Design an enzyme around this catalytic site. Structure first.
Site, PDB file in Angstrom:
ATOM      1  N   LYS A   7      -4.540 -12.371  -5.849  1.00  0.00           N
ATOM      2  CA  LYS A   7      -3.214 -12.968  -5.724  1.00  0.00           C
ATOM      3  C   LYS A   7      -2.379 -12.094  -4.779  1.00  0.00           C
ATOM      4  CE  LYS A   7       0.023 -15.861  -6.605  1.00  0.00           C
ATOM      5  NZ  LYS A   7       0.674 -15.935  -5.284  1.00  0.00           N
ATOM      6  N   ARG A  54      -8.584  12.617  -5.910  1.00  0.00           N
ATOM      7  CA  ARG A  54      -8.303  13.840  -5.173  1.00  0.00           C
ATOM      8  C   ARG A  54      -6.833  14.096  -5.377  1.00  0.00           C
ATOM      9  NH1 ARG A  54      -5.058  11.534  -1.275  1.00  0.00           N
ATOM     10  NH2 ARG A  54      -5.736   9.485  -0.516  1.00  0.00           N
ATOM     11  N   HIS A  77       5.238  -0.154  -4.246  1.00  0.00           N
ATOM     12  CA  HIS A  77       4.076   0.691  -4.461  1.00  0.00           C
ATOM     13  C   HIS A  77       4.458   1.729  -5.498  1.00  0.00           C
ATOM     14  CE1 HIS A  77       0.493   3.166  -2.993  1.00  0.00           C
ATOM     15  NE2 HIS A  77       1.141   3.994  -3.796  1.00  0.00           N
TER      16      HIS A  77
END
Lengths: 414, 414
Positions: A172, A262, A179
């Site tokens: 979607k 990381r 973010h």
């Protein structure tokens, strides 16, 4: 435990790692290309080893040479930083098979979270929310709901055609997503913690420019839910070390897109609001120690911002290599400067264009932002172009000031 | 409120004040001597005014010129920093009589705490512990107990003679005293808070070299007692603004020696462990606002250290004026750099030799110290001599590492 670490990286992160090592009394080995003989961390390292010529492929990505540097120095461990080989599972597998401690997750976990779908599938198994997604492709597309991505697709009459073209070369698609990413640590004692979140929505071509923590609008309830899900995911997949779960965030719901296995470039904003030293915890966790605190010990205090200062033209974004004839770095209360650049240093053409991370902290987002604007105004980098003018434009943007701008916002504004 | 502030100082503190002003959106006026045209804060200020030639007596101590700069710029307030005129009650009295806000206490309070005995007498009235002290001079000397000071005196057969000689030109003398000082704020709303303490025992000829916070060995009970006494003293004397109560500290008891009625040089270590911005609070308090927090909001977290970096020979201590051909300042997590010096700047002969304050923070004293050692190792000041080697000697001293060294210790060690 860990007595000697090869820093398999360069630039600012290499210096960040060297500083953590030196605090813990760990000896350092700086591996470097011929072009990086004058890097600050190289000049400060206990031992140095030239691992190849300038191009990354021949130096920082040169697996045999890095391993050989560990062997000849009698090092115990290798810290891969971010980028380069840090999420290369063949590198990790070879570091372990060769008797050294890889400061990061196990090879198998890297490979698992290194693949788009297998990652999403482990997360969905783990209870971490993923994006709704994966000729009965019209039926699937339909249930998910347009718009979609295979090439983006806003309707069904194009579906078929699109399918055949995206191939030769489905989440979607969201259009108000921010973010938002959750920092975690997991150790070899079965513990896993979350360290609040970061908002990194200010991006150009999927490259982050400004990051902040905590994420505006995220209440502690919501933090606790998504964070606890990430920690449990860590245990469920046998994660080890620092990592970040990246999400798209919208109308109050989270949707997993990637795990970086990381350390993160923008880890400092999390350090500023939690008091945790994330690189020191990487080193301690790799040595076999437990995380130095429990979840209840972590509380978000204040607000932090980071601007990635790059040697590039601030409108064209073309790199600006050259000699820094004069550097003046900012300081004072609530200002942190993470950079390998020094007056007289020449920024080379061969690598990324990041030259510094300027990080501010304040009791409120408003204070962190004003402190960033003032710190940027004090900063002088003479001899090359930087993206400081872009930062200044972002920081004074009324929508950024309000907070909550989405991942498409910067490109729209310019 | 306060819209425009004259920064009646120079060097690092002038920059510190400018940074606070700019965060609060306050316009700045940099008054400067002819020798200080290239000071960083002057170059950053909104307006500049040359107030005289190089010698301090003719510039930074020039009361009419500073007041005239306030008048012609239409400034609202004057911040005197530390040193120079900051504890000159005639200056304060004239700033007020001339219609400006003095950022500091009232003239009358300055004069009260400006005089040795009247200060001690107000403190003793206030309940703050003072040193046991003031021919029936043998009887007094006796009750107090030798050693004594009039010229120090270790016995009575010398008392008389000493008396006649110390005149032409009595605090119990202590020999294991540390220098421990309590930071306070008091506002115009009747509030007064204490912000833990600092240990500044590392001194040469009564000039501080290294400071730290909190003071090793001081428990929170003890902090609360002495701190509450200082806050009440503030209210009792009608104190206004930032100030410090300095004590000699021994076998668990405090003894008042002086109040500095101004901001302290070493204020940053307190900022690091409490999260308070002391200069911003000075500005807000001067504008008439309340202290931005209550006593219960303050909690010591971690540990901080400060090294005063001076342009001087590290053994002879003779000043080292000249052009800084290269500066490299340290950074990273828990490192704060407060300095006006920049590459290409010429340190002048006319003033004090301080060029920077390097401040570190850590979760423990041990971490703050190691971070200071590493930061000092990264620091480069090319072109002139500094006292960095002295700092390095101090930081690796086993007794300093243990903590609790007294005010005579440095001179003994060298």
């Amino acid at each position: 435990m860990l007595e000697k670490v090869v820093i398999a990286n360069r630039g600012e992160i290499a210096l960040r790692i060297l500083r953590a090592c030196k605090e813990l009394g760990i000896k350092t080995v700086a591996v470097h290309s011929t072009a990086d003989r004058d890097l600050k961390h190289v000049l400060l390292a206990d031992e140095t080893i030239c691992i190849g010529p300038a191009p990354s492929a021949k130096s920082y990505l040169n697996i045999p040479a890095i391993i050989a540097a560990a062997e000849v120095t009698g090092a115990d461990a290798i810290h891969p930083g971010y980028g380069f080989l840090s999420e290369n599972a063949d590198f990790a597998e070879q570091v372990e098979r060769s008797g050294f401690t890889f400061i990061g997750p196990t090879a198998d976990v890297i490979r698992l979270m290194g693949d788009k779908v297998s990652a999403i599938k482990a997360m969905k198994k783990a209870g971490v929310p993923c994006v709704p997604g994966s000729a009965k492709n019209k039926e699937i597309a339909k249930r998910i709901g347009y718009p979609i991505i295979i090439r983006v697709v806003r309707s069904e009459d194009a579906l078929e055609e699109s399918i055949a073209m995206t191939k030769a070369e489905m989440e979607k698609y969201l259009e108000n997503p921010r973010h938002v990413e959750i920092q975690v640590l997991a150790d070899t004692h079965g513990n896993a913690v979350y360290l609040a979140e970061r908002d990194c929505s200010m991006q150009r071509r999927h490259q982050k420019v400004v990051e902040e923590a905590p994420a505006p609008g995220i209440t502690e309830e919501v933090r606790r839910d998504i964070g606890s899900r990430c920690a449990n995911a860590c245990v469920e997949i046998g994660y080890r070390g620092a990592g970040t779960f990246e999400f798209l965030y919208e109308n109050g719901e989270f949707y997993f897109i990637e795990m970086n296995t990381r350390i993160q470039v923008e880890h400092p904003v999390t350090e500023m609001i939690t008091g945790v030293d994330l690189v020191k915890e990487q080193l301690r966790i790799a040595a076999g120690l437990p995380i130095s605190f429990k979840q209840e010990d972590i509380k978000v205090k204040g607000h932090a911002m980071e601007c990635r200062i790059n040697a590039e033209d601030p409108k064209t974004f073309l790199p600006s290599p050259g000699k820094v004839n004069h550097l003046h770095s900012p300081g004072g209360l609530g200002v942190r400067w993470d950079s390998h650049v020094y007056g007289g240093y020449t920024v080379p053409p061969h690598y990324d264009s990041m030259i510094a991370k300027l990080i501010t902290y304040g009791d409120t987002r408003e204070v962190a932002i004003r402190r960033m604007q003032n710190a940027l105004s004090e900063t002088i980098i003479d001899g090359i172009k930087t993206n400081i003018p872009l930062h200044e434009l972002i920081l004074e943007d009324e929508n950024f000031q309000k907070g909550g701008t989405n991942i498409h916002y910067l490109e729209k504004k310019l």
